[PDB]
Write a protein that binds this ligand. Structure first.
Ligand SMILES: Cc1cc2nc3c(=O)[nH]c(=O)nc-3n(C[C@H](O)[C@H](O)[C@H](O)COP(=O)(O)OP(=O)(O)OC[C@H]3O[C@@H](n4cnc5c(N)ncnc54)[C@H](O)[C@@H]3O)c2cc1C
Ligand SMILES: Cc1cc2nc3c(=O)[nH]c(=O)nc-3n(C[C@H](O)[C@H](O)[C@H](O)COP(=O)(O)OP(=O)(O)OC[C@H]3O[C@@H](n4cnc5c(N)ncnc54)[C@H](O)[C@@H]3O)c2cc1C
Lengths: 533, 538
């Protein structure tokens, strides 16, 4: 394959110049080698519009990255930067623009700094969560990671997509926990953000913004730069871990549950991941047994797509809670037991029929073997593959911390989803509180062996996106298939936001070589052809 | 006055067009009117380089701001946007480029939204901390502000300068607590950031980044747009407040104090402002400020005054301090939460400090069940710790506030290095030591005050000296995070990695978002293309 508008002779010269920088054994051109850069969960799998690489280049150093950018810029070669390329559900290892050369940074896997007393690290993009966890545990570090689940991927690459994990509130937002970056620009120049812009700065990983415009955010969900280094704020290993279960009896309890849980979260009574499920509706939380392990009354309810309210009588008869809220607490035993006691007192005052249980308690540190037995190792910053040890994408619109909105998005998107026949499984989609102050409402897409089905799945998802936007519910992260679809919903001021990103794109990357099309941002030379329809 | 390179007729056409938008009574041109737009604390006070304004326009609405921008862009009129203009120590109400038309947003004082249950607001730039606190207190709100001290100024204006306050760690960084913005660009278009870019978005003040590049940061310490609206995350009023004192006997205790305090902070044992001071050296503290305010001055020990008089070094106060039995260091930890929670947190902090410092002493300094009555609020040690904007410390200046790591060895190295360059020059350093200020988690600010004089010659000396201190700090990897227009180009010059890649990057964005270069020319050392060579730093 060739990059569109790039003749074969120009491409071959570009590739020879890359090989001269990184070595011929680190420039990949074969159909066999490039199959490994296909999106394993492509919603366009096997179709004309499938996103494919023209080639891949795997540099060893930031200096080589600079030289590859220089060469790409000169020859106008489109470059798609990945860190470890494990972005399954959101585009995998494939480019946003078919024909782009993948710049694969997986060899730049150096741990630049770990500071135990100040609880930070600085990492290259190739440092995986597994690499960093092994490094910290072998050093008997008292620092935790915040890891996705499962724990494949890169601290950098995950942060560049604004990914998430499951430890304390201040670390669950990976990009928000970063401090300082190094960026290579389209012209090959290298730039440090924040305090790192001062040579010999002592504070690159300690003070986020630096001096003047705070620019780090423009590189995330973006195509304005190649990130070569990133600092992260790390969570000290707490003294102890307490998970408490709150059980509520009524469907209608959701509205005051959301209000009270959000107040306690905002009051920092707990900093762990709040997990809400419905035992009555059989929805799962982080209980691992679910996949690992059938009342006729329940099965009939589930068969006829019963609404949530229809489970309340059944739940009440079986003595099953309608809602469980699991609160996680990190800190000294006496402290987290007092936080949990306060949480119970507030819930008992609001819900006189509320029941409570201590679900987990650990004094830290754990042994490797005790760690293997915790309900959800990601809550301890342990990257792991257990969750699915006994293809897809998702629409994950963000809603407020409001129970009325939890009900409205179910009522609104559940029906449009039923009309157009996406198989929603439970009575209800229960809101996910990944980050403080909002929820995500998670709808899976399943890849079919039939491209005609995949086409209808893409048309249905694009409808669900427009319906959600009409009710003020917007997506926060998506696969290339839907990136321009979602950016079109952010249309305030006649698409002011996209027109703004296009201005910065043209300033920082005038030749438009960096990850064309990423988050709906096309460089000026491709913008006419790739205007959203 | 005319804006430089603009003729009387063009200026008159622009002024007339502004008055057609905001009305004739809200366009100001007289010397007398414009005197209020001078920097009350100008380090150039009365001198030729003093930052002056050529006119001021005070619009009522964001739609009037759009039309003002359109007109200024049409006539290449340089515009300097202020919210309430209370930026004393950092430029006051004055532009970064003399002859700029001040765009004064003080009339845009609407509280767009307050949500008690989700603990947020959306405000216009004219909403002062005093206005907002009054609004919340009359409503008997269970939400707190994070306020500077003194509490004059604008939630938006202070946030746009990346200012700081004194409540819980997650609100003390005012820009970091913001969620969503509305910006008018140089061409007069309006844009909403984050989730507000979706018309009818329900999440503008709930989910910070929105979708695609997270751009809000580029408008802070910048000249890329005019901020017309901002969301803030607000702190729920906690159940209770507890402040504990840790007393340590030795100078050398600083290094492990910083280590242990930083670990407990990063472990969220406490979330309040940790206050470190030296009773022994008499360094300022929230506690010493309350005393000076309550009982006025106190008769100083002449043994203390002998040490202070001869500019004795910190180590020389240790024997004196152990004689009069006064601590060398006091660390005040502030806890917000349920009484049983904060008492347990303080108990845990005491156990940790007792194991690290077997000689440590402890006291509970302050405890309150919230809410406070108006009478208790009057009598707390430091009202800004309760989100109360106040004027107690009003009963001029600029600063060099370099940022250092949470490292005791750096705290000593910055004292030895700058507490001699300053001694070699004539800058008055009062105490034996500048004690680091933990404004935000994971760093310290090292505060050297510049005192503005009636003597212009002494203000020129002060400028030259501070420009030196900025270069010496830079050579030791200590960078300034905020400064007055006098020093903005000087500080931007220190961030020179990659042959000034950061400034050349900002200049590229400047030219894409403001090609005619009308927004706040020179702010944080960012000059538009047409002025860049003439104003190139030296
Ligand atoms: C079952 C399942 C569960 C998942 N759970 C989670 C979860 O808990 N949390 C979560 O966040 N994700 C989750 N994911 C999504 C995904 O697996 C992770 O986000 C993964 O960590 C991302 O891949 P990566 O770290 O290798 O990043 P990469 O794929 O290397 O990077 C992601 C994207 O960012 C850009 N990028 C990467 N590196 C750079 C760079 N150096 N400079 C500029 N741009 C760059 C590129 O466009 C790239 O495609 C899940 C997926 C599946 C299928
Ligand atoms: C004794 C003393 C103590 C102080 N203590 C503190 C303190 O504790 N914490 C603290 O943070 N500061 C402190 N300051 C500094 C200052 O008083 C405050 O930061 C003050 O709140 C800022 O002024 P303001 O809110 O009116 O902002 P403004 O002056 O309105 O805005 C600040 C700057 O931001 C830009 N700007 C403003 N509005 C906009 C807009 N809408 N769009 C684009 N750009 C805009 C302008 O360049 C403006 O000059 C102190 C000063 C003194 C003298």
């Amino acid at each position: 394959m060739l990059p569109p508008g790039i003749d074969s002779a120009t491409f071959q010269k570009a590739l020879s110049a890359f090989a001269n920088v990184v070595g011929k054994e680190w420039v990949f051109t074969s159909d066999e080698d490039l199959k490994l850069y296909r999106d394993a969960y492509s919603p366009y799998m096997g179709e004309a519009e499938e996103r494919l690489a023209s080639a891949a280049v795997a540099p060893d150093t930031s200096e080589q990255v600079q030289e590859i950018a220089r060469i790409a810029n000169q020859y106008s070669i489109p470059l798609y930067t990945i860190s470890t390329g494990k972005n399954l559900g959101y585009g995998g290892s494939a480019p946003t623009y078919s024909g782009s050369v993948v710049l694969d940074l997986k060899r730049m896997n150096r741990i630049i700094e770990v500071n135990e007393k100040q609880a930070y690290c600085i990492v290259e993009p190739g440092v995986s969560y597994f690499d960093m966890y092994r490094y910290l545990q072998e050093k008997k570090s008292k620092l935790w990671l915040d890891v996705p689940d499962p724990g494949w991927g890169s601290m950098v690459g995950n942060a560049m997509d604004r990914g998430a994990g499951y430890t304390a509130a201040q670390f669950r937002n990976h990009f928000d926990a970063h401090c300082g970056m190094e960026v290579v620009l389209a012209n090959g120049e290298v730039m440090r953000t924040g305090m790192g812009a001062m040579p010999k700065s002592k504070t690159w990983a300690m003070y986020k913004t630096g001096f003047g415009p705070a620019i780090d955010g423009i590189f995330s969900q973006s195509n304005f730069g190649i990130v070569t280094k990133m600092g992260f704020w790390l969570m000290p290993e707490p003294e102890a871990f307490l998970k408490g279960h709150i059980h509520l009896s009524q469907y209608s309890d959701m509205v005051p549950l959301v209000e009270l849980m959000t107040e306690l979260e905002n009051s920092k009574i707990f900093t762990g991941y709040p997990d809400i499920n419905s035992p009555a509706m059989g929805t799962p939380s982080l209980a691992g047994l679910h996949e690992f392990l059938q009342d006729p009354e329940f099965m009939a309810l589930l068969g006829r797509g019963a609404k949530p309210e229809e489970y309340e009588a059944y739940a009440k008869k079986k003595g099953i809670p309608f809602w469980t809220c699991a609160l996680t607490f990190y800190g000294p035993e006496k402290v987290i037991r007092a936080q949990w006691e306060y949480a119970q007192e507030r819930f008992k005052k609001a819900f006189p029929d509320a029941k409570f249980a201590e679900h987990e308690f650990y004094k830290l540190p754990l042994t490797p073997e005790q760690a293997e037995k915790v309900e959800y190792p990601a809550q301890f910053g342990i990257p792991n593959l257990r969750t699915f040890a006994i293809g897809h994408a998702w629409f994950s619109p963000v809603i407020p911390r409001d129970g009325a909105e939890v009900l409205k998005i179910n009522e609104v998107l559940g029906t449009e989803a039923r009309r157009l026949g996406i198989p929603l499984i439970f009575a209800m989609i229960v809101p996910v509180p990944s980050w403080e102050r909002s929820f995500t409402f998670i709808i899976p897409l399943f890849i079919s062996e039939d491209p005609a089905q995949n086409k209808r799945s893409r048309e249905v998802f694009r409808h669900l996106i427009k319906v959600a936007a009409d009710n003020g519910w917007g997506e926060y992260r998506t696969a290339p298939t839907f990136q321009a679809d979602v950016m079109d919903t952010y249309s305030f001021g006649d698409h002011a936001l996209l027109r703004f990103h296009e201005s910065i794109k043209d300033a920082v990357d005038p030749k438009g070589i960096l990850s064309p099309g990423r988050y709906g941002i096309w460089p000026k030379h491709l913008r006419d052809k790739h205007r959203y329809k």
